[PDB]
Design a protein around this ligand. Structure first.
Ligand SMILES: [Mg+2]
Lengths: 586, 1342, 49
DNA sequence: CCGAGCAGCATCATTACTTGTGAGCGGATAAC
DNA sequence: GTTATCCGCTCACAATGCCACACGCGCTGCTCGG
């Protein structure tokens, strides 16, 4: 039809001559010419060749691909065949049938705004006003304040505060969908009850941004309002974030406090030996909280507090043991959040990241769902609060270099030195020499790493009413690492201690590793080899992204039909699931 | 001591122990040097226009003895100029005129001409010159062509390790690639058989081409195999012997010589057996006849009287055939050495496979091969072959091609033929056969010595020659057909294809692109950019995971850091700082010529392979102050490696630490404390910075600012030194120093500073004059900072007081929290300038009209307009509003003359109006600041157009008026100081004004004579000024070129002042990107115990993971810098005595351990010291080189100089609680940019609006107010949940099913939520499209 | 948007899809080498019927 | 006469290092 | 010779998603046309 192959003009007599029109022109021209020849006495060879040419033309029209090319003029590129309008990522299938460009909602960049609860999300006033414009007109007409759509447009164009509180009411429960750009797995799209904020950004709860694998490096998110009633109730029932805490891949909790909150708690649930207030007795967590807020005691000093850890002994019951436990005011304060469930023994430790995941998981297992989402919200709130109250900060003198490292190097250095003699005197073969250099360097690397750790993890030396004690370090670094907050020791020892060996482009290992570190500079060559490694990694990611995309597409296609339909097939054939063994441990 | 008249304003304190030897070269060496290579009149023909000419010329006729050759060329002059071309929208053209001669030789006679016409300067095309910023000005915009990087045209050897036939059959193919022509290759069969082949055709049995070169099978084998002669003695089938020959493999029998039994019975000839056999000096062996088993014979055998072959060349030689030939002769027999270790019988086996054996047969074979289905005849195959190679026209290896070829074949002549030859082919074959053997060695394709760069110059002349060969063919045929001698050598050529080719290259090429012109650093790093894509180059899809890697030969040659993260990594590199292109196109790097023990300042520009052969020291290797390494086992690099060596084991030291990183990377402070995997994104972000209102110096800089600023074009560098006669907000007028000006030409020069002007990314560029008045500047100084530049130092972002601590999670992952103060001070509020062009076509109904009147819209929508429709300059427009103002001829087919005649007089202006005005796209506000107008001549002008014309006329007249003032003053001074000589007139030239000095009466011989002289001079001066004024008048008021029927192109400019706000993107200089997350009030922010708040609150947890400790160090140094600053501030708040401040600043500058610079502050005049101080109150800038940074001990010393604690950590007090934090936080002064990813360009929504025509789906793009692409993966994520109704309505009623969506909109406005899913219109589209083929497709009944 | 047109091809002609999409449906249908059907469509040979 | 539209064009050799894989076909290679 | 067997070569067929922004998209000696 003429519609589906439109001839759209330009500012002047310039028309976008779609390839279909041009191919049709060519083929119909050949047809007319050939017919006119057929009536005109038909020289045999000529009609033969013209039939061949017409076959070629109709061929090209059905498919510019086979038998050669029919590239367009002035643009050395083929013409869009009919088949082209079907196949490829541009054909109607993968372009408008399966995934069609929606019309109804929004797009922006995101920020954090952690004041909001887990199910909420930010929303700019401008985007909101633009989206629910139909609901706006509806609420205005039903309120009679504008009984004509024209006046409704005028009012929404003038933003009289009436429109503002009308909008506030109209989205009071109206869920919406936040969507990352590449939606890898089921969580890539989720729902939230929006709230109105200023600016143009999209605030959202932190935990769920860790869910999307959504960093805040400027990553844009799309929004989608579900409009029909069935759809809204659906989005509230299924894809609202508060109903997806267990990742469908693995039943592990997907909402895990990742960073900047785990640090807070870990700092709170720690124990400085002799801090201000050690040795008191506290009449309850609220008591110790009052004590700490008034600055009369540290946030983490050993004390004795009475606590009533509620317990679900039998189903439905709740016993209350008003025991007298020895803890720290940090843990005493944090206890004010657990919802009458978990025993105290889950808060008494250093409370690292894995410990937080454990806490959330046992809370969910024991107390259903709603108390757990409340607990998670409170955990995030208090974590941010006490992190800010902490003031954890990384200064240059924090990452203390293990002083003996130098010596160690020289030793290993001197080591490889005489090994070169072993080769310069031909007493040992070349390959074994290479392996021996590698091995002495690896041993020196492990020794310097253990030196850095032993000088870092327990560097603190303090005194309790007396001589001296050795407690775990309060350094900024290793308060992020040991907490599991951000980056493991495999990066710290790379920072403070020796960076170690690095890889050749092929994968081989250079003889001389990077004796240097990061707190100390690097000689040019050292940075060069580090660049080798880093660029290899980056290229790997840059290709694997597209490769994995194509792979998961083939996957979702080959299994897009399996839907659990029957309830029990009633069979007996099973596979013998066994605890796997690989030659090492299980 | 050597400080410029500008450096004295702010002398940057600098660390860096290493005293640099070679200053940073002109950062735009590539573009300028190469375009000079291309454009200048080269008398050598090695390259440039002359080379392309010598190639294409002399054109010859159909052997009609009428040739057309050249003698030389020349270039016209730009009719417009860079600002003229840049505003009027025309390319910076250059007329090309060539000196040709069409000679015709008499016939039928020997050579000589009886028919000839000389034509010099026939016009052929117009090439765009390179403006002095190393860029080009295509029509309107300013494009730049990046330098390409492609495999050196030549010969090399690939292995293809086991990736075929999967049995360790690595085939060492060898390919030869020319600078032009169809390349060639040889392959090893997976069964060890050679195969000559063309680019991609059927694999031929190799020896074919040897037979094609007129080779006899005898001579064939004589070029790849030995000759184990058999001087048949009286008995025993004698032969020669060298024990290496029989070394080989297992032996078969005792090979006794002279009777002495060396080879024991059996096998396993031992090295000791070989050794004693060599000891005996053996020269013969009795031999059993059966020993000869394979022994393929070389000489073909024929009886002495039968003529027939009796033993054919290269078939076999064995018992039967030997006994057979021994019934005729003989006395000579020779065969071919054979072995699996060496001298494999590949040539012989291929000749076995060889289909043809005759030369002409070989030519017809290759004739069918290259192009099948065609008549194989002798002459046709011969022409095809000897014009496939051996043809200077259709082939040329290269100059550098010949060089690389000869070197890769261990040849001697460094320069030779640019064309193949039989010896070169057989040498390639021989070396290849060796490569199959243990001998030789393959060479990679990533070694920089094999990949040459190729600038804009060579590529431009190549496109020139390519577009030239076609007009060459055309003019040859037109000279053939047409009358030989009836014409002038002026029209047989058609320059339209030449212009088309060159304009298509410079305008629409994969490499050409308008400059990334939003940031001086971005611009620079975009000029010296190396790519591997584009023509001749590989593409990113099939790029291969390998090539992207960095190769140890890159060190110092191409940056390993600066690289666009994304699909094209490694394929888009940036040239190193000190690097340079070779005379061929290779990458040379400067080194220092290490002599016996001295590291002399003598530099050498080493090539790649030259570096490979030598040993290279390390830049960081400290020295004993006399060229001698302090250490003894110094680290070094010899052959793509790293190892220690003795001080006498080295030959070349590095030149300076900086030569490894990019020019952009060079700008990164404390790089050596940072990891690459983050410094990369740091460099990228630095490229994507954005200019601000008042850019300021960065505190912690890398000293590279001077170069990157001045070597760019953004700063109006003073050309010739002098005194600042007159400054202004837009114009500078420099009176030249009395020496550096020509005898005439008072030549007081004028710098016209470009005011707010659009960028290729919609960023304002504004040069404010940084210089005072009356101050004297020397040659090559700064007179106007460009966008985001200060005092001639690259000033990208802002130095912000910043602390590293969490803050209620408002900096949760990496988001950045700021203080309303940073907004109130406008520290980041930037500008954006965007243009809107309303065009006026000429439809067949009639041309357009820009009349102010509009039939339908009211005065409210018209009030912003003038009588001419175009808006007043400065009217604050809002979205949706109408700028112009142009209506259109709407109707047709009325055909009522009785009304047409009415509306011929009453309505010819009011017949078919249709208001196709230009409205500002809804969403963007802004102030109009400028209106450019382009008119089609004939149509006079608009009142706005005429007004702008006269205004620009007056502007340009002002400068000539100034020059007239100064020349008039000089000449009247002359007439006074000369008229005095007599009269006397020494009291009337000064109280009586200039009324008639030219007419004052005195003596004649010289005095009235001098009056006559200066009268004629003054009058001709006025006259030439009038003439050039009229010339500017014409060049300004003349119409412009507008080809496709366009009358009035009205461009309007719009300036928006976009302030910072949540959602924007900010990043330091260490890849620590982030999104501004909250405009926290000034008081709520943390504040130091002296009251001063902290501006930005970053997130510390980002550091350990990202492993970029550098920034942290910088932060410390930052505070230290600022420390000094406030100190001086105190010294300036109260009027402290000068000498005190002088000594203090001096001591501050002498704080480093061993720094390269020793400023004295003596010979600084007092007010110069005060000026310097006033430019330091906001913090002493600190320069640290890239890889010689200030060790933290010096930072501690500096902080100690200030009154700030050494730990770089200060207690705080939350403005909310009022209490303190424990764990003293780290706070300093970090540099912070702002990227052009600000949220205003992203946030947009869509309730309902436009829809595509081909499918009733909504458009896409904020520009089109479109929706979002709910793509495949979103569909899958939905259907993973239940999400049935949601996905349903989203597919049908949200954005399809016109009836359905209209019903939805009409039903929801009535407060009812219900879907009416019909049919996706795109599905109807698919059905109709399939049905466009014979594929019937219906909907089932049920 | 729906009215489809049609063209009277002055001479019959082959549908590329059934003729070249490996395996050639025509070829399999006739037990004929695809090379032959190709060479006879493009007027270069003669098929006897 | 000369500008504006226009009708079917490989416009010679317009070349073109792989990307990785699968399927099929013409022809070498071996059993009956 | 047949008969099928397998193999080298040829040719078709796949290349993450979004976005955003930018740029650009007949011609040319026949045809017509007055
Ligand atoms: Mg991101």
């Amino acid at each position: 039809p003429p519609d589906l192959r439109p001839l759209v003009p330009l500012d002047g007599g310039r028309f976008a001559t779609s390839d279909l029109n041009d191919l049709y022109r060519r083929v119909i021209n050949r047809n007319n010419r050939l017919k006119r020849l057929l009536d005109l006495a038909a020289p045999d060879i000529i009609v033969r060749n013209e039939k061949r040419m017409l076959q070629e033309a109709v061929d090209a029209l059905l498919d510019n691909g086979r038998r050669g090319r029919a590239i367009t003029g002035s643009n050395k590129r083929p013409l869009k065949s009919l088949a082209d309008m079907i196949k490829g990522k541009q054909g109607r299938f993968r372009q408008n049938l399966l995934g069609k460009r929606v019309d109804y909602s929004g797009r922006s960049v995101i920020t954090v705004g952690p004041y909001l609860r887990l199910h909420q999300c930010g929303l700019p006033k401008k985007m909101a006003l633009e989206l629910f414009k139909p609901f706006i007109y509806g609420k205005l007409e039903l309120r009679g304040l504008a009984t004509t759509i024209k006046a409704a447009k005028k009012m929404v164009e003038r933003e009289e505060a009436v429109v503002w509180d009308i909008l506030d009411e109209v989205i009071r429960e109206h869920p919406v969908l936040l969507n990352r750009a590449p939606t890898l797995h089921r969580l890539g799209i989720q729902a939230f009850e929006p709230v109105l904020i200023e600016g143009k950004a999209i605030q959202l709860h932190p935990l769920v941004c860790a869910a999307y694998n959504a960093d805040f490096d400027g990553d844009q998110m799309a929004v989608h309002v579900p409009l029909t009633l069935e759809a809204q109730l659906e989005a509230r029932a299924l894809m609202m974030s508060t109903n997806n805490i267990l990742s469908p891949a693995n039943g592990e909790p997907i909402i895990v406090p990742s960073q900047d909150v785990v640090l807070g708690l870990y700092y709170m649930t720690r124990d400085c030996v002799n801090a201000k207030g050690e040795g008191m007795v506290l009449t309850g967590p609220k008591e110790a909280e009052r004590l700490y807020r008034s600055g009369l005691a540290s946030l983490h000093a050993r004390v004795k507090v009475r606590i009533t850890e509620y317990e679900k002994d039998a189903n439905g019951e709740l016993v209350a043991k008003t025991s007298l436990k020895d803890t720290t005011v940090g843990r005493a304060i944090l206890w004010m959040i657990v919802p009458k469930g978990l025993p105290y023994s889950i808060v008494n430790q250093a409370l690292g990241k894995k410990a937080i995941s454990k806490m959330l998981n046992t809370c969910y297992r024991i107390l259903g769902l709603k108390p757990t989402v409340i607990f998670a919200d409170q955990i995030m709130y208090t974590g941010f609060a006490y992190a800010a109250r902490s003031g954890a900060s990384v200064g240059i003198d924090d990452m203390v270099i293990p002083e003996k490292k130098h010596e160690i190097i020289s030793e290993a250095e001197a080591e490889v030195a005489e090994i070169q003699e072993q080769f310069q005197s031909g007493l040992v073969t070349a390959g074994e020499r290479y392996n021996k250099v590698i091995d002495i360097w690896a041993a020196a690397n492990d020794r310097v790493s253990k030196a850095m750790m032993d000088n870092l993890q327990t560097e603190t030396v303090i005194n309790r009413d007396g001589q001296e004690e050795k407690q775990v370090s309060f350094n900024s670094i290793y308060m992020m690492a040991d907490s599991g907050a951000r980056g493991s020791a495999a990066q710290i020892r790379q920072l403070a201690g020796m960076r170690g060996l690095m890889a050749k482009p092929d994968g081989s290992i250079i003889e001389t590793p990077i004796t240097a570190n990061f707190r100390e500079g690097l000689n040019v060559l050292q940075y060069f080899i580090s660049t080798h490694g880093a660029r290899k990694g980056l290229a790997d990611t840059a290709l694997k992204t597209a490769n994995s995309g194509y792979l998961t597409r083939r996957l979702v296609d080959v299994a897009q039909d399996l839907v659990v339909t029957e309830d029990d097939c009633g069979t007996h054939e099973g596979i013998m699931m066994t605890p796997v063994i690989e030659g090492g441990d299980v | 001591m050597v400080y410029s008249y500008t450096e004295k304003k702010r002398i940057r304190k600098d660390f860096g122990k290493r005293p640099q030897v070679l200053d940073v070269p002109y950062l735009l060496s590539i573009q300028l040097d190469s375009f000079q290579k291309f454009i200048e009149q080269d008398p050598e023909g090695q390259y440039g226009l002359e080379a392309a000419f010598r190639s294409v010329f002399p054109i010859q006729s159909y052997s009609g003895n009428s040739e057309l050759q050249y003698v030389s060329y020349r270039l016209g002059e730009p009719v417009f100029d860079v600002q003229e071309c840049q505003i009027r929208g025309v390319t910076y053209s250059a007329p090309l005129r060539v000196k040709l001669r069409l000679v015709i030789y008499e016939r039928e006679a020997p050579e000589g001409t009886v028919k000839d016409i000389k034509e010099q300067e026939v016009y052929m095309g117009e090439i765009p010159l390179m403006t002095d910023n190393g860029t080009f000005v295509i029509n309107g915009t300013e494009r730049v062509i990046v330098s390409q990087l492609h495999r050196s045209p030549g010969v090399f050897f690939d292995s293809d390790k086991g990736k075929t036939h999967s049995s360790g059959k690595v085939l060492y193919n060898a390919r030869i690639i020319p600078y032009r022509g169809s390349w060639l290759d040889f392959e090893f069969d997976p069964k060890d058989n050679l195969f000559v082949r063309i680019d991609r055709r059927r694999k031929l049995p190799a020896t074919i081409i040897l037979r094609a070169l007129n080779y006899t099978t005898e001579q064939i084998l004589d070029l790849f195999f030995e000759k184990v002669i058999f001087e048949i003695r009286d008995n025993k089938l004698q032969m020669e012997l060298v024990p290496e020959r029989l070394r080989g493999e297992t032996a078969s029998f005792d090979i006794e010589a002279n009777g002495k039994v060396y080879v024991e019975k059996g096998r396993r000839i031992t090295a000791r057996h070989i050794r004693q056999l060599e000891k005996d000096d053996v020269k013969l062996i009795e031999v059993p006849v059966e020993y000869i088993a394979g022994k393929v014979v070389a000489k073909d055998y024929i009886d002495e009287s039968t003529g027939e072959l009796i033993c054919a060349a290269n078939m076999e030689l064995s018992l039967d055939l030997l006994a057979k030939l021994s019934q005729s002769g003989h006395k000579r027999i020779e065969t071919l050495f054979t072995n699996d270790l060496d001298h494999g019988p590949y040539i012989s086996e291929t000749l076995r496979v060889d289909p043809t054996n005759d030369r002409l047969s070989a030519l017809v074979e290759i004739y069918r091969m290259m192009r099948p289905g065609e008549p194989p005849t002798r002459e046709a195959a011969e022409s095809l072959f000897e014009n496939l190679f051996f043809s200077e026209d259709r082939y040329d290896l290269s100059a550098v091609g010949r060089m690389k070829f000869n070197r890769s074949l261990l040849r001697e002549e460094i320069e030779g033929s640019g064309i193949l030859s039989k010896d070169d082919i057989i040498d390639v074959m021989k070396k290849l056969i060796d490569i199959r053997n243990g001998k030789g060695e393959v060479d990679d394709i990533d070694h920089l010595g094999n990949r040459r760069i190729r600038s804009v110059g060579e590529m431009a002349e190549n496109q020139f020659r390519v577009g030239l060969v076609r007009v060459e063919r055309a003019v040859k045929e037109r000279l053939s057909l047409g009358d030989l001698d009836t014409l002038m050598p002026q029209d047989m050529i058609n320059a339209k294809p030449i212009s088309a080719a060159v304009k298509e290259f410079f305008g629409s090429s994969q490499l050409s692109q308008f400059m990334d012109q939003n940031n001086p650093l971005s611009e620079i790093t975009h000029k010296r950019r190396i790519s591997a894509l584009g023509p001749g180059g590989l593409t990113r899809e099939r790029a291969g995971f390998e090539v992207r890697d960095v190769h140890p030969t890159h060190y110092g040659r191409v940056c390993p850091i600066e690289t666009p993260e994304g699909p094209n990594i490694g394929l888009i590199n940036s040239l190193s700082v000190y690097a340079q292109t070779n005379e061929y196109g290779f990458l040379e790097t400067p080194y220092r010529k290490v002599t016996d023990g001295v590291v002399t300042d003598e530099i050498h520009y080493l090539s790649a392979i030259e570096e490979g052969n030598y040993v290279i020291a390390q830049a960081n290797s400290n020295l004993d102050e006399e060229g001698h390494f302090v250490e003894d086992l110094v680290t070094c690099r010899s052959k793509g490696e790293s190892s220690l060596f003795s001080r006498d084991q080295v030959d070349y030291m590095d030149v300076s630490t900086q030569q490894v990183v990019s020019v952009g990377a060079s700008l990164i402070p404390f790089l050596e404390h940072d990891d690459a995997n983050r410094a990369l994104m740091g460099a990228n972000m630095q490229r994507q910075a954005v200019p601000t209102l008042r850019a300021d110096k960065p505190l912690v800089g890398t000293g590279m600012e001077r170069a990157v600023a001045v070597d760019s074009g953004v700063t109006a560098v003073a050309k010739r030194g002098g005194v600042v006669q007159y400054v202004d907000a837009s114009r500078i007028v420099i009176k030249v120093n009395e020496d550096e000006m020509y005898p005439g030409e008072a030549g007081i020069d004028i710098y016209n500073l470009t005011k707010y002007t659009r960028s290729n990314q919609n960023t304002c560029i504004n040069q404010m004059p940084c210089v005072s008045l009356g101050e004297p500047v020397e040659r090559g100084d700064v007179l106007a900072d460009g966008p985001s530049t200060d005092l001639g130092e690259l000033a990208l972002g802002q130095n912000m007081r910043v602390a590293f601590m969490p803050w209620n999670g408002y900096n949760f992952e990496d988001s950045i929290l700021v203080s309303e103060r940073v907004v109130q001070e406008d520290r980041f509020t930037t500008i954006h300038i965007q243009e809107l062009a309303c065009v006026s076509r000429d439809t067949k109904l009639g041309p357009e009209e820009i009349t102010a009147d509009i039939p339908n819209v009211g005065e409210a929508a018209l009030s912003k307009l003038d009588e001419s429709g175009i808006v007043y300059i400065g009217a604050e427009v809002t979205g949706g509003d109408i700028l112009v103002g142009k209506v259109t001829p709407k109707g047709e087919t009325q055909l009522t003359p009785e009304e047409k005649l009415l509306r011929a007089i009453f309505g010819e202006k009011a017949s078919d109006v249709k208001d196709s005005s230009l409205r500002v796209p809804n969403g963007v506000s802004g102030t109009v600041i400028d209106v450019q107008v382009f008119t089609r001549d004939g149509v006079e002008k608009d009142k706005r157009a005429l007004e702008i014309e006269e205004m620009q006329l007056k502007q340009a007249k002002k400068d000539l008026s100034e020059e007239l003032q100064i020349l008039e003053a000089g000449l009247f001074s002359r007439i006074r100081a000369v008229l005095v000589a007599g009269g006397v007139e020494a009291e009337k030239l000064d109280k009586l004004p200039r009324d008639r000095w030219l007419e004052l009466g005195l003596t004649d011989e010289e005095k009235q004579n001098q009056l006559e002289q200066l009268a004629e001079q003054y009058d001709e001066l006025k006259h030439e000024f009038e003439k050039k004024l009229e010339a500017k008048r014409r060049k300004i008021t003349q119409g412009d070129d507008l080809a496709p029927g366009v009358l009035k192109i009205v461009k309007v400019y719009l300036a928006v002042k976009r302030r910072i706000q949540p959602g924007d993107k900010m990043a330091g200089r260490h890849g620590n990107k982030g999104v501004i997350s909250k405009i926290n009030p000034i008081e709520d922010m943390p504040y130091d115990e002296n009251g001063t708040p902290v501006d930005i609150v970053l997130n510390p947890l980002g550091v350990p993971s990202r492993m970029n400790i550098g920034q942290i160090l910088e932060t410390h140094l930052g505070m230290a810098a600022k420390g000094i600053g406030d100190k001086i501030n105190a010294m300036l708040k109260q009027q402290q005595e000068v000498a005190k401040l002088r000594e203090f600043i001096q001591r501050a500058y002498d704080l480093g351990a061993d720094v390269r610079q020793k400023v004295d502050l003596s010979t600084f005049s007092d007010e110069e010291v005060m000026r310097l101080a006033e430019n330091l109150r906001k913090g002493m800038p600190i320069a640290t080189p890239v890889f010689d940074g200030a060790k933290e001990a010096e930072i501690k010393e500096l902080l100690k100089l200030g009154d700030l604690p050494t730990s770089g950590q200060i207690r705080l007090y939350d403005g909310r609680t009022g209490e303190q934090f424990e764990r003293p936080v780290t706070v300093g002064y970090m540099y912070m940019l702002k990227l052009n990813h600000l949220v205003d360009d992203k946030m947009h929504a869509r309730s309902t609006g436009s829809y595509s025509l081909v499918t009733q789906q909504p458009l896409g793009g904020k520009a089109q107010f479109g929706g979002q692409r709910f793509g495949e993966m979103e569909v899958w994520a939905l259907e993973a949940y239940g999400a049935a109704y949601t996905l349903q309505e989203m597919l049908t009623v949200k954005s399809d099913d016109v009836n359905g969506r209209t019903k939805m909109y009409k039903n929801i406005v009535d407060g009812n939520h219900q879907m009416e899913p019909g049919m996706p219109e795109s599905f109807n589209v698919l059905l109709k499209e399939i049905r466009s083929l014979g594929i019937n497709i219906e909907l089932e009944d049920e | 948007r729906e009215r489809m047109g049609h063209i009277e091809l002055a001479s019959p002609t082959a549908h590329i899809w059934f003729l070249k999409s490996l395996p050639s449906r025509i070829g399999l249908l006739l037990d004929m080498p695809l090379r032959d059907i190709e060479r006879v469509l493009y007027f270069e040979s003669y098929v006897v019927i």
